[PDB]
Amino acid sequence: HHAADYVLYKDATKPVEDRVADLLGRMTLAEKIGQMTQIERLVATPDVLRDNFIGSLLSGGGSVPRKGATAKEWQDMVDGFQKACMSTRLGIPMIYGIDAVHGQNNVYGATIFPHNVGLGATRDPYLVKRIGEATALEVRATGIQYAFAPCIAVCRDPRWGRCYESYSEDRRIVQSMTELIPGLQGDVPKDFTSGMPFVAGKNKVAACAKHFVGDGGTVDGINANNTIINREGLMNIHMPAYKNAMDKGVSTVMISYSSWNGVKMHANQDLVTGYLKDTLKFKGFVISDWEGIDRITTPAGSDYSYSVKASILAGLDMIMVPNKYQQFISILTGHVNGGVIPMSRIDDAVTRILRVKFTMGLFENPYADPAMAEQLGKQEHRDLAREAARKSLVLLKNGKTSTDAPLLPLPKKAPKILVAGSHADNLGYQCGGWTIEWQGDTGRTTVGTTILEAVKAAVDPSTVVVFAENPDAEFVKSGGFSYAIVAVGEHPYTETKGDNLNLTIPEPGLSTVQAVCGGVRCATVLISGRPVVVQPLLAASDALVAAWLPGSEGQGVTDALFGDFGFTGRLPRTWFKSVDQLPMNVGDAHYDPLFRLGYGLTTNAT
Numbered sequence: 001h002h003a004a005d006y007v008l009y010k011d012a013t014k015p016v017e018d019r020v021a022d023l024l025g026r027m028t029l030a031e032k033i034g035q036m037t038q039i040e041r042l043v044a045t046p047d048v049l050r051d052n053f054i055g056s057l058l059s060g061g062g063s064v065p066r067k068g069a070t071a072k073e074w075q076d077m078v079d080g081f082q083k084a085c086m087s088t089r090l091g092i093p094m095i096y097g098i099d100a101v102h103g104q105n106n107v108y109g110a111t112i113f114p115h116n117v118g119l120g121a122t123r124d125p126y127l128v129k130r131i132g133e134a135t136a137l138e139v140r141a142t143g144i145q146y147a148f149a150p151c152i153a154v155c156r157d158p159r160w161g162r163c164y165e166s167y168s169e170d171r172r173i174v175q176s177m178t179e180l181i182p183g184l185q186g187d188v189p190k191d192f193t194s195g196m197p198f199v200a201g202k203n204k205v206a207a208c209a210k211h212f213v214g215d216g217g218t219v220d221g222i223n224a225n226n227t228i229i230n231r232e233g234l235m236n237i238h239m240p241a242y243k244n245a246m247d248k249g250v251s252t253v254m255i256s257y258s259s260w261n262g263v264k265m266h267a268n269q270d271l272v273t274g275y276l277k278d279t280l281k282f283k284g285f286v287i288s289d290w291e292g293i294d295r296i297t298t299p300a301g302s303d304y305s306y307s308v309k310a311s312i313l314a315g316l317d318m319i320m321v322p323n324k325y326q327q328f329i330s331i332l333t334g335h336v337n338g339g340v341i342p343m344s345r346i347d348d349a350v351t352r353i354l355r356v357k358f359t360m361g362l363f364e365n366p367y368a369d370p371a372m373a374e375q376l377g378k379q380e381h382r383d384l385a386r387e388a389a390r391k392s393l394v395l396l397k398n399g400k401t402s403t404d405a406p407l408l409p410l411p412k413k414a415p416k417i418l419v420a421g422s423h424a425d426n427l428g429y430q431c432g433g434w435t436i437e438w439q440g441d442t443g444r445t446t447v448g449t450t451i452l453e454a455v456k457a458a459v460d461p462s463t464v465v466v467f468a469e470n471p472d473a474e475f476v477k478s479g480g481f482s483y484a485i486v487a488v489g490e491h492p493y494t495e496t497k498g499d500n501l502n503l504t505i506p507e508p509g510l511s512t513v514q515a516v517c518g519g520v521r522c523a524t525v526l527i528s529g530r531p532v533v534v535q536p537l538l539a540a541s542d543a544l545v546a547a548w549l550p551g552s553e554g555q556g557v558t559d560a561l562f563g564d565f566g567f568t569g570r571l572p573r574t575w576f577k578s579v580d581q582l583p584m585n586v587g588d589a590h591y592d593p594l595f596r597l598g599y600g601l602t603t604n605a606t
């Protein structure tokens with residue numbers, strides 16, 4: 001279809017499948033394995049991208065061009081890498097991925113949304129769609145086309161360090177929140193065939209259902225460990241949301257570090273090829289996790305040859321190396337040249353990768369749009385995160401006896417109030433992990449509103465707001481306070497660092513609650529990624545709110561404290577009485593919760 005130097009794969013009017021086949025039929029082995037290789041920006045250069053025909057780049061947690069970088073600095077970095085890839089013989093654009101898992105969260109000034117557990121408390125899949133939408137805009141603001149989200153793990157033990165990344169211990173809630181997918185990628189058209197990848201265009205991003213499969217089912221919640229459960233329970237608990245994801249066109253699927261009955265997911269052909277691809281009819285690409293093929297062996301990385309063989313034969317398409325690309329490429333080349341991995345396997349991987357790239361428009365818009373930069377941190381997105389933060393809150397107690405005046409909602413006018421605790425004025429703590437750094441961080445790490453700031457923005461001008469982080473009991477009794485808001489809880493964590501067998505909050509936490517509440521009527525705001533031992537905090541407190549990890553918009557918290565909106569959130573997980581009970585889920589026989597799944601007190605707006 002027309003000029004003398006026409007190449008069908010470069011013709012935007014042709015069907016994706018015809019373009020895929022046209023390009024694939026031209027490619028060398030090197031160009032093919034290149035597509036299959038994803039590297040960290042930290043190791044990427046223009047020569048490395050060109051010479052190794054690299055298919056993808058990522059930023060892992062905290063992998064940024066510099067601290068504080070602007071949206072434009074990110075666009076320019078990504079476009080630099082693209083320009084190198086576009087200069088190869090075939091000019092195949094790279095796809096750049098990132099963990100945008102509660103907003104565009106590695107980026108300074110990005111809207112930071114509540115983490116997933118809190119979103120589950122909302123029971124509002126439309127709200128989660130809208131968060132998808134806004135996250136896609138903020139990702140494309142930085143020139144990035146691919147988000148490693150949603151995590152559709154079904155966390156079955158809150159001792160897991162990634163429990164906050166699971167919407168619920170109930171798979172039906174997880175299923176309902178796969179609406180993140182069409183928010184990120186766009187709605188699929190009415191005809192659509194379940195399992196096909198989809199992205200609407202340059203203002204949307206490819207998504208990633210992760211981590212396949214049973215990541216939330218591991219023994220004692222140990223991260224990346226073994227999930228022991230028969231097929232029927234794998235398929236009833238851990239798998240269903242993957243089928244919802246196929247029905248909504250999710251473009252990619254990332255594999256878990258975890259094992260199922262002792263078989264590493266990254267080496268599981270039966271599940272990745274037999275089930276995901278051949279039964280669910282998934283046609284997008286399957287990506288490993290970070291050195292996930294290295295971790296097939298024990299010790300990790302002790303037979304990289306076998307890691308390559310086992311993963312690629314299992315059905316993985318794209319490998320998140322992410323650093324030792326030269327070794328990956330050489331090993332896989334040798335396996336193909338030796339007949340150990342057939343060309344049909346390579347060609348299937350490359351067909352899928354290319355399918356997603358063409359489908360999403362990447363050959364038509366390889367470069368960033370500078371007019372999108374101003375989407376970062378936009379107020380309309382902050383307003384959405386604020387609504388989500390408010391909706392996520394679960395009111396656990398609102399009075400010590402059933403005859404007390406309900407403490408919440410608090411009045412905005414009072415002569416003097418106290419805001420206290422390690423989490424009252426600490427933006428990093430209220431965002432949790434995967435915020436600016438991989439592990440998150442402490443303090444004013446990004447743009448946002450702390451609980452303290454939100455208080456001061458909410459109250460009547462005559463109300464004097466005193467902050468003390470850790471006041472003693474005399475300070476409070478002498479202070480002339482009408483009431484106090486005290487916020488305490490978990491520190492940021494991510495992945496295996498967050499695995500915790502005791503689930504007791506760090507001190508001082510309880511001691512400040514006790515000191516404050518012993519002097520004046522108090523509302524305690526508990527910031528956590530999961531249920532934690534709570535009976536001592538409850539016994540001290542007039543009211544207590546589970547606020548989860550509500551993100552940058554701390555005014556969502558005070559919107560409910562001061563009665564601008566009623567409390568509506570409901571527990572999306574079981575609250576245990578003791579960690580010796582665990583695992584314990586809505587359903588077992590020994591089901592003896594402190595608060596059952598679905599519990600939450602309400603208030604009315606004033």
Ligand SMILES: *[C@@H]1O[C@H](CO)[C@@H](O)[C@H](O)[C@H]1NC(C)=O
Pocket residue numbers: 222224225226259262
């Ligand atoms: C689970 O963790 C244990 C104890 O740390 C370790 O020895 C074992 O290899 C892990 N198993 C898997 C399958 O990851």
Ligand SMILES: *[C@@H]1O[C@H](CO)[C@@H](O)[C@H](O)[C@H]1NC(C)=O
Pocket residue numbers: 499500501502503504
């Ligand atoms: C419980 O576990 C955590 C994290 O693994 C540890 O840091 C903490 O000190 C423990 N708490 C107690 C009271 O032993």
Ligand SMILES: *[C@@H]1O[C@H](CO)[C@@H](O)[C@H](O)[C@H]1NC(C)=O
Pocket residue numbers: 603604
């Ligand atoms: C809130 O409004 C509901 C719905 O009408 C009402 O029945 C409930 O008891 C109210 N509670 C308070 C404290 O106003």
Ligand SMILES: OC[C@H]1O[C@@H](O)[C@H](F)[C@@H](O)[C@@H]1O
Pocket residue numbers: 059060061062063290438
């Ligand atoms: O374990 C080290 C690395 O692990 C990944 O899961 C993160 F995304 C990285 O940025 C991090 O530094």
